[PDB]
Design a protein around this ligand. Structure first.
Ligand SMILES: *OP(=O)(O)OC[C@H]1O[C@@H](n2cnc3c(N)ncnc32)[C@H](O)[C@@H]1O
Ligand code: NA
Length: 645
DNA sequence: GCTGATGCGTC
DNA sequence: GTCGGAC
DNA sequence: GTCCGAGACGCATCAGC
């Protein structure tokens, strides 16, 4: 028999044979170490196609030898507990995880934290960790499904003292870990596998696997490499087609619990016959590509006619109306928010004609003040309860701004152009002021008329404009292009928006790709009244890899053991390295918000809360400025007031 | 019962 | 959400 | 262009008090 120890499993080898090169036998549980070894081979390469090939080899062995374990192996590869709509949450972050490592090793929680921060990866701490659990019985090797079952067991633990119950399961896993298993179990619980391979690549590997090694064969499978009879060119074309069948199906039914059973019983080629878009099953939403100016929009949309629509500052709400009356609402991430919007459920009868029997609407939920009849800031929207039983208790009303229709009366509109989908939206749905409204739109290509429209959108309390083609490449097929729309935000424009010069007062050690250097920084404004620096926000994006290495080499010389007395951070995350205030960086953000932690400009707008920056990004260093010339807290307050108008 | 840390989702 | 890097 | 992996702040949960 095949007694290959999993420690030697190599899914990246040339001429991989699904049966003979697997490190487990027919009918045996897929060892979790087989998955870990696959992760190792995947993270040491940078080409996606090489990663897909490697994962595909594992999946072919699983199909050939252990079909029941295909589903848990996929979820482990994605670092997911299940379909997004089932609302499964581990309830385990770095806090719970690091606490579990400390007890499993006898170390102080502070020591494990420091080491994890230094290495930038909890997985490397759990692997180099000396285990204190002097167990008197060697545990069996972990299995892929067994580890997946324990992860779901962790999720289901709720109530008081549940944390200690979660830790016990985690500790039990680590005591049974061998080789690199502990590394990836810790990474999975942290939520940071660091593979460089995610949803799109897992689908590509899956489609390739079931195409090369069709499931459902009599063992041993007579057909283990269905590409052998094809030329390289025909093989590539054939695999791309099968990949699209899986991608487009998944985009309409992103639920492996529904796809994999069909896949194993009927094959990939017949998958669309048994799995298709349906109300009650969320689908992947169309996303937008950032554009930096109106000129870029015409370039990307040369020739093709397009429309512009207000980009409202709310939350995406995918509204499903099933044949029968059942209504469900999903988020951008396929999460079920039905219980959050009882006021929207009771509103559906008002927005549709008597002929509408089912639909899937793409809308933006926006906080709405019925007294003043005006859009309220996104911040007000986030104060709604996540499970509102009685609509009579809701305090923040919402108005739905519909901008697309994906399904109508039992028929999918995914292959229709926007012009038709938009037309079906207007002909079949009814507007109500402040409750359900079509997105304010404009059809033109006159640059002058677009800039005016962009301005009016900002005056009407919007982030900017969405630009979408009407007929050329204007379908809702996410597998063909997920970012088929263009977003033009006010703060994308060169020289427009909020730009601040802030003092660097602290550095945070980086994680993953940022390990061994600073991944983020603590910034502050200058309060000229008390002559103190007040933390305003953290910063962790906007610089190249080369700029960030220079920030590391430069700021390392400013590291202090204790903070200066004139530096107030109050409730902000204490930096790993206090920095002598000196460096002044130019920062851009989308908005300013009243913060519950940051002290910047406290007392200049509200007595208790300071001000922070929404989505800050690094622009450039200001070598011509010292901390005393940084943006003042007074200027921060003035900036915040210019918003509230 | 209350507070604050933690987890996770929204942008 | 933003951003940059490797392909 | 694709794909992937490197902020503020709100509710909800829960450990510690
Ligand atoms: O920045 P981003 O990529 O999340 O932007 C896309 C999001 O913008 C919201 N939005 C608001 N108004 C619209 C219209 N008219 N069309 C499309 N999207 C819109 C959505 O929430 C979307 O996810
Ligand atoms: Na590169």
């Amino acid at each position: 028999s095949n007694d290959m120890d999993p420690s030697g499993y190599n899914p990246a080898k040339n001429n991989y044979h699904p049966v003979e090169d697997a490190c487990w036998k027919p009918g045996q549980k897929v060892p979790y170490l087989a998955v870990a070894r696959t992760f190792e081979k995947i993270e040491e390469v940078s080409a996606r196609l090489r990663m897909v090939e490697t994962l595909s080899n594992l999946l072919r062995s699983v199909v050939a030898l252990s079909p029941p374990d295909l589903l848990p192996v996929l979820y482990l590869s994605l670092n997911h507990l299940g379909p997004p709509q089932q609302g499964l949450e581990l309830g385990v972050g770095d806090g719970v995880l690091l606490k579990a490592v400390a007890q499993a090793t006898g170390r102080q929680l502070e020591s494990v934290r420091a080491e994890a921060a230094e290495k930038g990866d909890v997985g490397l701490v759990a692997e180099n960790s000396r285990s204190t659990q002097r167990l008197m019985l060697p545990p069996p090797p972990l299995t892929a499904s067994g580890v997946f079952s324990k992860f779901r067991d962790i999720a289901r633990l709720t109530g008081s003292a549940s944390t200690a119950k979660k830790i016990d399961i985690i500790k039990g896993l680590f005591v049974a870990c061998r080789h690199s298993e502990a590394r990836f179990i810790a990474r999975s619980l942290s939520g940071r596998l660091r593979l460089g391979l995610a949803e799109q690549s897992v689908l590509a590997a899956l489609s390739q696997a079931v195409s090369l090694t069709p499931p459902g064969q009599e063992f041993p499978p007579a057909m283990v490499d269905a590409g052998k009879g094809k030329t390289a060119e025909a093989r590539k074309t054939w695999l791309e087609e099968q990949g699209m069948i899986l991608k487009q199906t998944f985009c309409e039914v992103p639920d492996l619990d529904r796809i994999i059973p069909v896949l194993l019983e009927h094959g990939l080629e017949r998958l669309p016959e048994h799995c298709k878009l349906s109300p009650g099953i969320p689908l992947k939403p169309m996303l937008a590509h950032p554009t930096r100016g109106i000129s870029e929009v015409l370039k990307r949309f040369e020739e093709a006619a397009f429309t512009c629509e207000y980009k409202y500052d709310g939350q995406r709400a995918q509204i499903h109306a099933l044949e029968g009356g059942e209504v469900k609402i999903f988020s951008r991430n396929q999460e079920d928010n039905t219980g959050k919007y009882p006021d929207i459920i009771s509103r559906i009868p008002k927005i549709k004609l008597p002929s509408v029997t089912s639909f899937i609407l793409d809308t933006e939920a926006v906080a709405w003040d019925r007294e003043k009849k005006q859009i309220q800031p996104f911040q007000v929207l986030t104060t709604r309860k996540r499970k509102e039983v009685d609509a009579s208790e809701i305090q923040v009303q919402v108005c739905l701004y519909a901008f697309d229709l994906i399904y109508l009366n039992g028929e999918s509109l995914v292959r229709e152009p926007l012009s038709r989908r938009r037309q079906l939206l207007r002909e079949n749905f009814v507007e109500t002021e402040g409750e359900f409204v079509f997105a304010t739109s404009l059809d033109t290509k006159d640059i002058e008329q677009i800039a005016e429209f962009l301005e009016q959108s900002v005056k009407d309390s919007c982030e900017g404009l969405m630009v979408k083609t009407l007929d050329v490449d204007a379908t809702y097929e996410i597998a063909k292009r997920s970012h088929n729309w263009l977003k033009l935000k006010k703060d994308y424009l060169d020289g427009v928006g909020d730009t601040l010069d802030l003092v660097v007062i602290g550095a945070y050690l980086g994680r993953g790709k940022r390990a061994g250097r600073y991944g983020g920084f603590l910034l502050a404004s200058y309060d000229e009244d008390s002559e103190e620096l007040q933390a305003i926000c953290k910063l962790g994006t906007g610089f190249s890899d080369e700029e960030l290495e220079e920030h590391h080499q430069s700021l390392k010389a400013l590291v202090l053991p204790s903070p200066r007395p004139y530096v107030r951070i109050d409730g902000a995350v204490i930096p790993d390295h206090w920095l002598d205030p000196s460096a002044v960086w130019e920062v851009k953000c989308a908005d300013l918000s009243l913060s519950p932690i940051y002290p910047a400009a406290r007392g200049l707008v509200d007595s208790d809360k300071g001000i922070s920056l929404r989505l800050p990004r690094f622009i450039r260093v200001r070598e011509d400025k010292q901390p005393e010339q940084a943006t003042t807290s007074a200027q921060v307050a003035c900036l915040y007031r210019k918003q509230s108008q």
